[PDB]
């Protein structure tokens, strides 16, 4: 689709059996998820920064489903205060900026 | 342009007579930047709120070119880790998230 930016560009998510919604941020490096319960290994990282890091739990080549796109990548799963879609992701769906 | 996202979109912005670095931030509602010197009346704003809110200077209807695309909107003037240019400029500029 073409996604203009009057409103904040929230979409819908399909992860780990569930449906989220999940801000499209360029700005943002990862994709940061809350409340998913994905399965199989993960590793520790600490994100952020300013004022202290917070560590979540780093999930590599999750099957995700954006708008209809089935795609796989990492997806750190923690305390977020919106849902976060980062350019990891995106990069996948092969989404760009256009003007 | 056509910007991919395997990078940090980071633009070349003109304002205030100065060119600058500016990251296009889909999500941010708002464009900050830091160190610009920009003329006439501005109102203090009240941003971020997660542990304190900043407060910074709202200009209005400043000309900022972006790309090469001249430009009006309002710039917040502040401390920022990065100058952002958030969704108030990109639907200026006409910027969508394509896929
Ligand atoms: C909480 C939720 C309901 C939202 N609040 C908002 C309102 N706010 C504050 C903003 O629009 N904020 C803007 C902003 O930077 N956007 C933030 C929104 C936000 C708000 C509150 C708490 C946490 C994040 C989200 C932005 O993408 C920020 C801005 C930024 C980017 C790079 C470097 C420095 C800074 N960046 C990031 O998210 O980077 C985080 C990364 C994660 N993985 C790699 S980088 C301003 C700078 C203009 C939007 S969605």
């Known amino acids: 689709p073409q996604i203009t930016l009057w409103q904040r560009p929230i979409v819908t998510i399909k992860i780990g059996g569930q449906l989220?919604?999940?801000?499209?941020?360029?700005?943002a490096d990862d994709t940061v998820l809350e409340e998913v319960n994905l399965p199989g290994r993960w590793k520790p990282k600490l994100i952020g920064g300013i004022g202290g890091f917070?560590?979540?739990?780093?999930?590599?080549?999750?099957?995700?489903?954006?708008?209809?796109?089935?795609?796989?990548?990492?997806?750190?799963?923690?305390?977020?205060?919106?849902?976060?879609?980062?350019?990891?992701?995106?990069?996948?769906?092969?989404?760009?900026?256009?003007?």
Request: aromatic share 4%.
């Open 54 to 99: 917070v560590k979540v739990r780093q999930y590599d080549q999750v099957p995700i489903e954006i708008c209809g796109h089935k795609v796989i990548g990492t997806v750190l799963v923690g305390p977020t205060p919106t849902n976060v879609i980062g350019r990891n992701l995106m990069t996948q769906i092969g989404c760009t900026l256009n003007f």
């Open 20 to 27: 989220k919604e999940a801000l499209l941020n360029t700005g």
